[PDB]
Amino acid sequence: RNEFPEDPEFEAVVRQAELAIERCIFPERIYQGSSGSYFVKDPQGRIIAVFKPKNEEPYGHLNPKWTKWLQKGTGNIFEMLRIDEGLRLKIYKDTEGYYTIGIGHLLTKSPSLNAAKSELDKAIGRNTNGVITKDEAEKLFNQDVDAAVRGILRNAKLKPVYDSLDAVRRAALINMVFQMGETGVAGFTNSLRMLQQKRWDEAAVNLAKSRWYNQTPNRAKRVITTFRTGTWDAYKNLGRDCLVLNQGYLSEAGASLVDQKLELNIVPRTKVVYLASETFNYSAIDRVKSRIGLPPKVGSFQLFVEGYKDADYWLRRFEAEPLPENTNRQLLLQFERLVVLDYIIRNTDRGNDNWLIKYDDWVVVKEPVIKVAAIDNGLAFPLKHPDSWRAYPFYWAWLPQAKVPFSQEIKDLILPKISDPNFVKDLEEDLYELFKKDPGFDRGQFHKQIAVMRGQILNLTQALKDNKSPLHLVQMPPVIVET
Ligand SMILES: Nc1ncnc2c1ncn2[C@@H]1O[C@H](COP(=O)(O)OP(=O)(O)OP(=O)(O)O)[C@@H](O)[C@H]1O
Ligand SMILES: Nc1ncnc2c1ncn2[C@@H]1O[C@H](COP(=O)(O)OP(=O)(O)OP(=O)(O)O)[C@@H](O)[C@H]1O
């Protein structure tokens, strides 16, 4: 059900896409894309669009890169604990103050370092002098995992639960018996009951309250969600966490909404579109029921533009051979629109590969020589400002173009809109109607998104009134406007 009566040009392109699929001309996967980025083509083989299925997103469930991972099932217990325990080749103290080594291997609860060092030689088979190798730490690791699996299966309170768990939760319980040992996890009998009855939101709470967790919450909270969600999501991207989890396609489409309303027209038109293609990455199940073929996947569909190179490609050239004044002033105006987009949607990823330039008495405006396309917008609309601005900056702030004060032209375009509270209200309702359609939508998460966006507008409004540069704009302390 793909229709956009508001945008018959967009719909027409989409219809060529579907028809081209019917004719067995499949969107082909961009190499040097996310595994989940595709080139949509029409029946004549030309590239009309870029398509990014939600479920093939980097955090995506059907993402090819992480498919290898989901097979292991419990066998992910190794990587899971490597991440939680880290690696050390020399004796250290654990969270409780106990002598430890390699990957989470507890030597003794004794205060004596030679108890521990002694205890270490017993294990390794030589005089270690408190220092072991990578292979030695790995050998302790397997034995300690076996000991956990044994601890679970030799135990009456634990075993029943474990057998009722899916491959992933089992891994979580092993995780626990690795840190606390057999006997310790069996004092949780409540949560084991819930886990046992399959109520996830039940148990995820009680483990939230324990002597454990309290000591190492950062780790504890990582399993609890592995218990609650039956997935590896806490061990995938720990953490981006500036952003909502698997809504990249909506960022993509949303970026295009904003462009539309502010009338910037740098974002090639992008909407939420459903497509089915044999070239996509589907569950084996789905592949089989098709024999009634593959189901359509929901994704961002962004129109394709020709004649453009990397911002990087061109700016490199304009520096060696500077543009004539008049053309170069057309660049700056395309550039201001980009800064406004990115500041408003709070893009966390814009590099010089993430935007594109094209360089070529009357009723009509002479065509512009230079023009800016803003692509790859699925990393915006954060839940909050990034903790270290250096990790997720605005790259264009260090460009010289960022030094030039905002043009009257932009103030004229943008101030009347973002100064009108009814514009910002309408803009937020439109984003809501887009975002609420996601099955994993959360009203509370949304409000935070809007808060950031409202704080960015607050800053941009005053930056524009003062004729500040883009650079001075980003130096303004980030704010949120919270209801
Ligand atoms: N709308 C578009 N029109 C024309 N070309 C595009 C468009 N979008 C992307 N491209 C080209 O395809 C490449 C796709 O890059 P894009 O970053 O959008 O996908 P991605 O690589 O999956 O994202 P990421 O780089 O974050 O993994 C771009 O570098 C650009 O060269
Ligand atoms: N590339 C950028 N992207 C985003 N924000 C930036 C960028 N460059 C500067 N800023 C913002 O401008 C402000 C300028 O601070 P700057 O780093 O120049 O001095 P500073 O006081 O050392 O910053 P801090 O001590 O907070 O790291 C920072 O608070 C930051 O918010």
Swiss-Prot record:
Keywords: Acetylation, ATP-binding, Cell membrane, Cell projection, Cytoplasmic vesicle, Disease variant, Endosome, Epilepsy, Golgi apparatus, Intellectual disability, Kinase, Lipid metabolism, Lipoprotein, Membrane, Mitochondrion, Nucleotide-binding, Palmitate, Phosphoprotein, Synapse, Synaptosome, Transferase, Ubl conjugation. It is an enzyme of class 2 (transferase). Widely expressed. Highest expression is observed in kidney, brain, heart, skeletal muscle, and placenta and lowest expression is observed in colon, thymus, and small intestine. Changing R316W: Found in a patient with cutis laxa, a choreoathetoid movement disorder, dysmorphic features and intellectual disability; uncertain significance; reduced phosphatidylinositol 4-kinase activity in patient cells; similar to the wild type, it rescues low PI4P levels when transfected in PI4K2A-null cells suggesting no effect on function in PI4P synthesis; does not affect localization to intracellular membranes. Changing K72A: Abolishes enzyme activity. It is found in: Golgi apparatus, trans-Golgi network membrane; Membrane raft; Cell projection, Dendrite; Presynaptic cell membrane. Residues 346-354 are annotated as: Catalytic loop. It is a lipid-anchor. ATP binds at Y31, Q32, G33, S34, S35, G36, S37, K52, Q302, L303, F304, V305, D376. Changing L379A: Abolishes enzyme activity. One of its GO terms (molecular function) is magnesium ion binding. Residues 57-59 are annotated as: Important for substrate binding. Palmitoylated by ZDHHC3 and ZDHHC7 in the CCPCC motif. Palmitoylation is cholesterol-dependent, and required for TGN localization. Ubiquitinated by ITCH; this does not lead to proteasomal degradation. Residues 309-317, 389-398 are annotated as: Important for interaction with membranes. Changing L243A: Abolishes enzyme activity. One of its GO terms (biological process) is phosphatidylinositol biosynthetic process. Its EC number is 2.7.1.67. GO terms for cellular component: cytoplasmic vesicle; cytosol; dendrite; early endosome membrane; endosome; endosome membrane; glutamatergic synapse; Golgi membrane. It catalyses: a 1,2-diacyl-sn-glycero-3-phospho-(1D-myo-inositol) + ATP = a 1,2-diacyl-sn-glycero-3-phospho-(1D-myo-inositol 4-phosphate) + ADP + H(+). It is linked to Neurodevelopmental disorder with hyperkinetic movements, seizures, and structural brain abnormalities: An autosomal recessive disorder characterized by failure to thrive, global developmental delay with intellectual disability and absent speech, seizures, hypotonia, inability to walk, orofacial dyskinesia, involuntary movements, and structural brain abnormalities. This is Phosphatidylinositol 4-kinase type 2-alpha. It comes from Homo sapiens (Human).
